[PDB]
Design an enzyme around this catalytic site. Structure first.
Site, PDB file in Angstrom:
ATOM      1  N   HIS A 102       0.832  -1.189   0.000  1.00 17.10           N
ATOM      2  CA  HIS A 102       0.000   0.000   0.000  1.00 17.10           C
ATOM      3  C   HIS A 102       0.869   1.243   0.000  1.00 17.10           C
ATOM      4  CE1 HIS A 102      -4.112  -1.737   1.413  1.00 17.10           C
ATOM      5  NE2 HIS A 102      -3.498  -2.564   0.582  1.00 17.10           N
ATOM      6  N   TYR A 129      -9.512   5.158   7.839  1.00 17.96           N
ATOM      7  CA  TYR A 129      -9.650   5.382   9.280  1.00 17.96           C
ATOM      8  C   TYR A 129     -10.709   6.476   9.338  1.00 17.96           C
ATOM      9  CZ  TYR A 129      -5.226   2.976  10.360  1.00 17.96           C
ATOM     10  OH  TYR A 129      -4.228   2.036  10.523  1.00 17.96           O
ATOM     11  N   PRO A 188      -3.986  -0.616  18.823  1.00 20.36           N
ATOM     12  CA  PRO A 188      -3.887  -0.970  17.400  1.00 20.36           C
ATOM     13  C   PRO A 188      -4.032   0.140  16.370  1.00 20.36           C
ATOM     14  CG  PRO A 188      -5.898  -1.831  18.337  1.00 20.36           C
ATOM     15  CD  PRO A 188      -5.032  -1.409  19.492  1.00 20.36           C
ATOM     16  N   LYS A 220       1.285  -0.719  15.194  1.00 21.19           N
ATOM     17  CA  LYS A 220       2.673  -0.861  15.631  1.00 21.19           C
ATOM     18  C   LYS A 220       3.058  -2.106  16.450  1.00 21.19           C
ATOM     19  CE  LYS A 220       3.642   2.650  13.389  1.00 21.19           C
ATOM     20  NZ  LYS A 220       4.191   2.319  12.063  1.00 21.19           N
ATOM     21  N   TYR A 280       3.985   6.376  10.235  1.00 24.40           N
ATOM     22  CA  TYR A 280       3.159   5.254   9.789  1.00 24.40           C
ATOM     23  C   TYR A 280       3.938   4.157   9.071  1.00 24.40           C
ATOM     24  CZ  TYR A 280      -1.089   2.745   8.671  1.00 24.40           C
ATOM     25  OH  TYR A 280      -2.076   1.778   8.632  1.00 24.40           O
TER      26      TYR A 280
HETATM   27  C1  LIG Z   1      -7.184  -6.098  17.036  1.00 20.26           C
HETATM   28  C2  LIG Z   1      -5.642  -5.972  16.865  1.00 20.26           C
HETATM   29  C3  LIG Z   1      -5.128  -5.462  15.740  1.00 20.26           C
HETATM   30  C4  LIG Z   1      -3.751  -5.350  15.566  1.00 20.26           C
HETATM   31  N1  LIG Z   1      -3.291  -4.866  14.445  1.00 20.26           N
HETATM   32  C5  LIG Z   1      -2.004  -4.756  14.246  1.00 20.26           C
HETATM   33  C6  LIG Z   1      -1.467  -4.357  12.891  1.00 20.26           C
HETATM   34  O1  LIG Z   1      -2.161  -4.098  11.914  1.00 20.26           O
HETATM   35  N2  LIG Z   1      -0.083  -4.190  12.837  1.00 20.26           N
HETATM   36  C7  LIG Z   1       0.755  -4.392  13.971  1.00 20.26           C
HETATM   37  O2  LIG Z   1       1.961  -4.205  13.926  1.00 20.26           O
HETATM   38  N3  LIG Z   1       0.218  -4.857  15.166  1.00 20.26           N
HETATM   39  C8  LIG Z   1      -1.077  -5.068  15.305  1.00 20.26           C
HETATM   40  N4  LIG Z   1      -1.534  -5.621  16.428  1.00 20.26           N
HETATM   41  C9  LIG Z   1      -0.572  -6.240  17.460  1.00 20.26           C
HETATM   42  C10 LIG Z   1       0.064  -7.610  17.237  1.00 20.26           C
HETATM   43  O3  LIG Z   1      -1.007  -8.508  16.980  1.00 20.26           O
HETATM   44  C11 LIG Z   1       0.836  -8.073  18.459  1.00 20.26           C
HETATM   45  O4  LIG Z   1       1.696  -7.012  18.910  1.00 20.26           O
HETATM   46  C12 LIG Z   1       1.598  -9.391  18.222  1.00 20.26           C
HETATM   47  O5  LIG Z   1       0.650 -10.509  18.384  1.00 20.26           O
HETATM   48  C13 LIG Z   1       2.656  -9.586  19.304  1.00 20.26           C
HETATM   49  O6  LIG Z   1       3.374 -10.799  19.073  1.00 20.26           O
HETATM   50  P1  LIG Z   1       4.069 -11.630  20.261  1.00 20.26           P
HETATM   51  O7  LIG Z   1       4.655 -12.798  19.622  1.00 20.26           O
HETATM   52  O8  LIG Z   1       4.938 -10.706  21.027  1.00 20.26           O
HETATM   53  O9  LIG Z   1       2.863 -12.109  21.244  1.00 20.26           O
HETATM   54  P2  LIG Z   1       1.652 -12.997  20.987  1.00 20.26           P
HETATM   55  O10 LIG Z   1       1.120 -12.980  19.715  1.00 20.26           O
HETATM   56  O11 LIG Z   1       0.651 -12.763  22.210  1.00 20.26           O
HETATM   57  O12 LIG Z   1       2.238 -14.538  21.261  1.00 20.26           O
HETATM   58  C14 LIG Z   1       2.724 -14.886  22.539  1.00 20.26           C
HETATM   59  C15 LIG Z   1       2.715 -16.420  22.637  1.00 20.26           C
HETATM   60  O13 LIG Z   1       3.200 -16.892  23.890  1.00 20.26           O
HETATM   61  C16 LIG Z   1       2.416 -17.984  24.397  1.00 20.26           C
HETATM   62  N5  LIG Z   1       2.538 -18.073  25.832  1.00 20.26           N
HETATM   63  C17 LIG Z   1       1.858 -17.311  26.759  1.00 20.26           C
HETATM   64  N6  LIG Z   1       2.166 -17.615  27.981  1.00 20.26           N
HETATM   65  C18 LIG Z   1       3.051 -18.667  27.865  1.00 20.26           C
HETATM   66  C19 LIG Z   1       3.607 -19.453  28.819  1.00 20.26           C
HETATM   67  N7  LIG Z   1       3.342 -19.151  30.084  1.00 20.26           N
HETATM   68  N8  LIG Z   1       4.381 -20.482  28.427  1.00 20.26           N
HETATM   69  C20 LIG Z   1       4.594 -20.643  27.155  1.00 20.26           C
HETATM   70  N9  LIG Z   1       3.982 -20.057  26.147  1.00 20.26           N
HETATM   71  C21 LIG Z   1       3.234 -19.024  26.583  1.00 20.26           C
HETATM   72  C22 LIG Z   1       1.050 -17.617  23.946  1.00 20.26           C
HETATM   73  O14 LIG Z   1       0.144 -18.727  23.888  1.00 20.26           O
HETATM   74  C23 LIG Z   1       1.300 -16.977  22.539  1.00 20.26           C
HETATM   75  O15 LIG Z   1       1.323 -17.986  21.524  1.00 20.26           O
HETATM   76  C24 LIG Z   1      -2.879  -5.782  16.589  1.00 20.26           C
HETATM   77  C25 LIG Z   1      -3.424  -6.347  17.750  1.00 20.26           C
HETATM   78  C26 LIG Z   1      -4.756  -6.475  17.888  1.00 20.26           C
HETATM   79  C27 LIG Z   1      -5.313  -7.090  19.185  1.00 20.26           C
END
Ligand SMILES: Cc1cc2nc3c(=O)[nH]c(=O)nc-3n(C[C@H](O)[C@H](O)[C@H](O)COP(=O)(O)OP(=O)(O)OC[C@H]3O[C@@H](n4cnc5c(N)ncnc54)[C@H](O)[C@@H]3O)c2cc1C
Ligand SMILES: Cc1cc2nc3c(=O)[nH]c(=O)nc-3n(C[C@H](O)[C@H](O)[C@H](O)COP(=O)(O)OP(=O)(O)OC[C@H]3O[C@@H](n4cnc5c(N)ncnc54)[C@H](O)[C@@H]3O)c2cc1C
Lengths: 391, 391
Positions: A72, A201, A293, A297, A385
């Site tokens: 985009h 948006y 969100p 980021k 952005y």
């Molecule tokens: C509605 C929404 C829209 C979003 N849109 C965007 C977007 O367009 N662009 C963007 O950059 N970000 C966006 N985000 C954010 C992005 O989704 C998250 O920041 C991303 O999921 C973070 O990744 P992570 O791997 O750090 O954590 P997570 O995805 O939460 O993964 C963490 C993992 O650890 C596991 N875990 C938890 N506890 C334990 C434990 N005790 N032992 C072992 N395993 C465990 C969990 O089961 C999970 O699989 C959005 C978020 C939401 C909610």
């Protein structure tokens, strides 16, 4: 069992870090509390920065993305009966963003890890971290009723907001900064073509609305809702009616509706912890910070944390320069705070806040009029952005 | 007595409007409640935008200003042990600001009016406005015990925040937007050379401080103070000690102190009224809006209101196009809201707010780090500071 780097969490952060390290010859084990299916069910992110796109290529997992992702060059903001396009490409100096689902990125990484033969333990229950300040930390977990121990050199806490890792650091060592917003986003995923080729948006008197997508035949829509709402009170019918009420007429009439594949409410919050490490434990992604969100980021900050950690670990193992790891937090926090500020700004100018006086409402409206009408104003939105440079 | 335009208030707005109209052949009478001396005693403004500088030239009152005014090409913001200079000239596309006291501008205008022979009534007591919606409005006032009547075509309310003009419009016709800040500025005028050749706005943990000037041998300093403070509790000695505590060490040591010529506390507020007219009455300057002094916009907005009113009155009288006067408010409010937004932004990032949580403090600090570190960010500050274009 023994490994070099133990990784808690098989979400995108843990998988991406695991893949990068594996490719550089650094053995790592990933421990995940849930099943592969549960992880794959989380919709989440849709927008990726170029830095994340480049990191996926470096990790050799960009085939499907290069084919299926949508690049985009612009984004649209609608307010007070106006629709303003921000030419990201022109205003940021040639950068763009890529739309590719988080579910897709996770699937690609999982398939790559599976193929490499690297160790991944799903359904790793009761994970506990030990001797974090020692030279030999270890992780204990239960697999099918039996308690196993995993020895390692370092631990990467990539376990999200509710993970065990941030909880394993002495509370008095951490300083938390947090802000809870008085609203959530009700999201709906539909197998219908998106209403626009770019994101919209919308700031509307009834509240925020966002028109996003996953592909040419799959859309993702959101509407701001109070924290007191229940997803079961929102039928597909009610969602579509409400969405239409918040969009410009011309956009609302071209809208192709349809039954939902997924519907959920995500509350908005900002959260930062300082520092992001303790002894041999390093936090990355949602385990260390949450951004609303609105600015897209979250996943993108997880990517820069991981890129920094991977590069510092490389120097420690390959070049024997372990001292560089002390710098992890300082490097990451500089980028995190700037992304937090942008996500906060975006949230404050696009949402309807309860109990807002007349002066504040006018200022909110003037912020949009000024930022969207000035070349300098548009440039601050565009550069933030597409994403600020990695350090 | 009769005149064409009756002007309530001999502060800079009324005098500037009176001078411009007189030069174009439109007779006007200025009614002032106070004495010339009282008006001349108000210190107030020090920073003028180029548009105001050009308007003074158009009114033929720029001799002394061209000689004595100081053209500034940059301004400095100090925070967290850093001093950042904003090159206004480079970043705004060649524009600059001029430092020339409001007392000086007022003196120049008063001397010009006195010389032209135009009518000015000082000590005009009990001013009352009548028949505002009629074709023949009039003003009544008392001069030396006797009540006189002044017939006119239009009335310009240039009587400041506490004037009679805004009070003469039916309350239900006006919508007020207001915001009161929890602090004031304690100012001190000293006959000493300024600490810097450019202004220094300082954000410090103890609160805001500003190093300004009037000439090469006269300085004007300010420090943020609670609204509960009394000027008599602040000796010159206490002021200098407090000022020094809020400035960078290198700046604080080059500071030449001295006894005060003037000391006062100005509380900070934002205030806007919509519309800015009623029938034959038109409000201009502080009578219609107040901006916190942080952005140096007050007098400068009075100038654009007056420039707009003068030009519309010219068309009405010279070209018989009286319908154009209905547009006054819409034209002025566009510029007013943008200046209000900037003055609000400046105030929120430079001051210490009571009861601010840890998240907000970090965001405030990050706003400065981002805006002062990005070329796009610096440009938004510069273009707003030199002043947005007149419509
Ligand atoms: C509605 C929404 C829209 C979003 N849109 C965007 C977007 O367009 N662009 C963007 O950059 N970000 C966006 N985000 C954010 C992005 O989704 C998250 O920041 C991303 O999921 C973070 O990744 P992570 O791997 O750090 O954590 P997570 O995805 O939460 O993964 C963490 C993992 O650890 C596991 N875990 C938890 N506890 C334990 C434990 N005790 N032992 C072992 N395993 C465990 C969990 O089961 C999970 O699989 C959005 C978020 C939401 C909610
Ligand atoms: C500490 C401080 C610093 C500032 N710094 C700056 C700066 O650097 N740059 C900038 O642009 N702005 C600055 N400002 C703002 C600027 O001083 C004002 O916006 C400016 O004085 C407004 O001019 P005015 O003519 O509209 O009103 P005023 O100056 O208030 O004059 C109104 C006049 O009307 C008279 N009047 C009142 N009631 C009546 C009545 N009932 N009958 C007849 N006469 C009446 C009053 O006596 C007064 O003479 C600053 C203000 C302060 C307080």
């Amino acid at each position: 069992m023994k490994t070099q780097v133990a990784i808690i969490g098989a979400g995108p952060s843990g998988l991406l870090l695991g893949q990068l390290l594996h490719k550089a010859g650094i053995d790592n084990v990933i421990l995940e509390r849930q099943t592969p299916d549960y992880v794959l069910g989380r919709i989440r992110a849709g927008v990726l920065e170029q830095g994340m796109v480049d990191l996926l290529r470096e990790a050799g997992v960009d085939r499907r993305m290069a084919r299926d992702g949508l690049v985009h060059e612009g984004v649209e903001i609608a307010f007070a009966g106006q629709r303003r396009r921000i030419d990201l490409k022109r205003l940021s100096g040639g950068k763009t963003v890529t739309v590719y689902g988080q579910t897709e990125v996770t699937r690609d990484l999982m398939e790559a890890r599976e193929a490499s033969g690297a160790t991944t333990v799903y359904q790793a229950a009761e994970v506990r971290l030990h001797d974090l300040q020692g030279e030999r930390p270890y992780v204990t977990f239960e697999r099918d009723g039996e308690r196993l121990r995993l020895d390692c050199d370092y631990i990467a806490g990539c376990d999200g907001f509710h993970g065990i890792s941030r909880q394993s650091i002495p509370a008095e060592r951490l300083k938390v900064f947090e802000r809870v917003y008085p609203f959530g986003w009700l999201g709906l995923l539909a197998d219908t073509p998106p209403v626009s080729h770019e994101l919209i948006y919308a700031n509307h008197p009834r509240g925020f609305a966002l028109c996003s997508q996953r592909s040419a035949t799959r859309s993702r829509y959101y509407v701001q809702v109070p924290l007191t709402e229940k997803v079961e009170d929102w039928s597909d019918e009610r969602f579509w009616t409400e969405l239409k009420a918040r969009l410009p007429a011309e956009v609302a009439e071209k809208l192709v509706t349809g039954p939902s594949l997924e519907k959920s409410i995500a509350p908005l919050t900002s959260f930062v912890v300082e520092p992001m490490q303790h002894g041999r434990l390093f936090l990355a992604g949602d385990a260390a910070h949450i951004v609303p969100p609105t600015g897209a980021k979250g996943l993108n900050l997880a990517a820069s944390d991981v890129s920094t950690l991977y590069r510092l670990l490389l120097k420690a193992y390959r070049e024997g320069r372990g001292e560089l790891l002390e710098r992890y937090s300082a490097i990451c926090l500089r980028r995190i705070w700037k992304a937090e500020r942008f996500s906060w700004w975006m949230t404050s100018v696009l949402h309807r806040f309860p109990d807002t006086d007349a002066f504040s409402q006018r200022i909110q409206q003037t912020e949009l009029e000024y930022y969207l009408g000035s070349e300098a104003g548009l440039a601050t939105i565009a550069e933030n952005y597409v994403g600020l440079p990695y350090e």
